[PDB]
Amino acid sequence: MITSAAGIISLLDEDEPQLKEFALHKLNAVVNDFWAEISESVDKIEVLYEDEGFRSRQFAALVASKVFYHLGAFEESLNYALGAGDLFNVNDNSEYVETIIAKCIDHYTKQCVENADLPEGEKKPIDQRLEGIVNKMFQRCLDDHKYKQAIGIALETRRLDVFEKTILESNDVPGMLAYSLKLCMSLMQNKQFRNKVLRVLVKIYMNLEKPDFINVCQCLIFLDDPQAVSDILEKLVKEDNLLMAYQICFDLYESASQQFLSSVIQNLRTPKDQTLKMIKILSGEMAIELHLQF
């Protein structure tokens, strides 16, 4: 075969930016085996990347990322893979590509989780190419007709816009909404992020063709938004739909606390028989009476 890359690595040392790029191309072709030799010479590729380059700035990044990946330093491999730019070619069944994708996803999730809690303006910038790689993975997962678990990646990365987009522009919107609500209530811990996700969920619910008022009221109970639930009830009673409101008020009494119930009742106070018996439901007279009778 070749049995030695020493000649190819030596081609790099020359001062000709036409020989250098062929050396880089052969070196990438053979990095599948000769990372051991190329590792000691990586520094030359490092400096070659750190210049104008003339296609060296392009290909040397990928070569150095590949050799560092083979070596074991993923932290340094990521920087050069990002610097590669368009030469990464996310769409290919390569183990190096898969591993760098995983490392980049983990790095992005860590960075987002870390910087989310910090102030609104005091945020350490993300790398735009790293964001682009993450979004390319998002879009590939969407294109694979794999709508689910893109929500999971979005949840981990703490970015909502993708979460909203993937959970809307997908089949089985009810099923995806149920999965998202299960995740939001069960697994995730951060209360602020949970409230943000639930706000997105209720927005999606309401903008649905047939709003799921019961799940909307559940999410609103979680958010502690008596004004919003009161407005929902007001709209639901202005429009001719009474059984919806009946069950909504029953569930509101069964779940929400006394303070929330009092606040929503006050908001409603601010035919009238419907409103009066809604107030009675929320106060719980009939709930307790029915339980005692049972």
Partner: peptide, 15 residues
């Protein structure tokens, strides 16, 4: 087997 002792030395050093 092919006496690539330099290759083996590099591999052992880096592994």
């Amino acid at each position: 087997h092919y006496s690539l002792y330099d290759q083996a030395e590099k591999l052992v050093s880096k592994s």
